[PDB]
A = this chain, B = another copy of it.
Amino acid sequence: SMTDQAFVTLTTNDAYAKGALVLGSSLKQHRTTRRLVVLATPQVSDSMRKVLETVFDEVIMVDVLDSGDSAHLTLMKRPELGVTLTKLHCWSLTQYSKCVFMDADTLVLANIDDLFDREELSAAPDPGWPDCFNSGVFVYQPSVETYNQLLHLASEQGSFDGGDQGILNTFFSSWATTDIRKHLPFIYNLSSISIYSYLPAFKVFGASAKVVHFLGRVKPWNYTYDPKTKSVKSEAHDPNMTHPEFLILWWNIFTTNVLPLLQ
């Protein structure tokens, strides 16, 4: 609990760092008793690393890993996600016994320390292709064995989607079919696109949501926010705007709790 377990995020730049900052703040807000760790790469500015060190217990510098897999990334319309291979470094954190990896585009709404009851690999179904798990929230065990197997698989075969999710699903191939306890409830990784696709289910189950995931190309930090009125300017067909209170929450935490540390 105290020091052998951690939440772990990743940021390769100052843009996703604002996300990592909001995530870590929300984990603090909901009183985690676990360490907070962030993986960062050299593009993150020196000043931003310093700010990350005020929220996170440790900022750990790693090299970018980039799939360069243009084909499969285009197939997803996410040409910019080749560097998500950098996530594989999370397995190197052998200073911890068990960890929860959380995408820097997530936001915690409730304490989720009970995720440490789960065993590797435990993750929520991915909307869209639900026999694959979504790699935005997952419980794992750091291991030089696993780390190096994953790096080898990455270098030899790559990823079916050009990012971390394909390779992680291929490596952890039994998830769909084995042990229901490794299927985390969707309320630990609620994507805005599920709120948009089956709003009736969200109206009935959505109040129990513990983690919201701002999945997709447009990230919370790309919206224009007005803190006087607590409003965002938005464009047609936006899954974030079905239930925009999550996005406004993100911005509220940024504006009041993160912006002062960026002074």
Q: Tell me, yes or no, whether A126 is within 8 Å of chain B by CB.
A: yes
Which residue of B is nearest A131, CB measured?
A: B186
From B72, B130, B132, A126 is in contact (CB under 8 Å) with B130
A200 CB within 8 Å of chain B = yes
| Binary flags per residue of A109-125, CB closer than 8 Å to B gives 1, else 0 | 00000000000000011
**Interface segment out of the listed A37-45, A92-100, A176-184:** A176-184
Nearest Cβ on chain B to A188's Cβ, whole angstroms: 10
| Interface SS of A by simple majority | mixed
Q: How far is the CB of A255 from chain B (nearest CB, A)?
A: 31
Determine which of B179, B197, B201 lies in contact with A180 in the assembled complex, contact meaning CB atoms within 8 Å.
Answer: B179
Q: List 13 A-B contacts (CB under 8 A).
A: A75-B203, A76-B199, A76-B200, A127-B128, A127-B129, A128-B193, A129-B194, A129-B205, A130-B186, A132-B198, A132-B201, A160-B200, A169-B201
Cβ contact within 8 Å between B186 and A177:
no
Interface centre among A126, A128, A193, A199 (most CB of B within 10 A): A128
In the bound complex, CA of A76 to CA of B201 (Å):
10
By CB atoms of chain B within 10 A, which of A130, A161, A204 has the most? A130
Known interface pairs A178-B180, A180-B180; A200-B130 also in contact (CB < 8 Å): no
A244 within 8 A of B: no
Instruction: Say yes or no: is A185 at the interface (Cβ < 8 Å to chain B).
Output: yes
A82 in the interface (beta carbon within 8 A): no
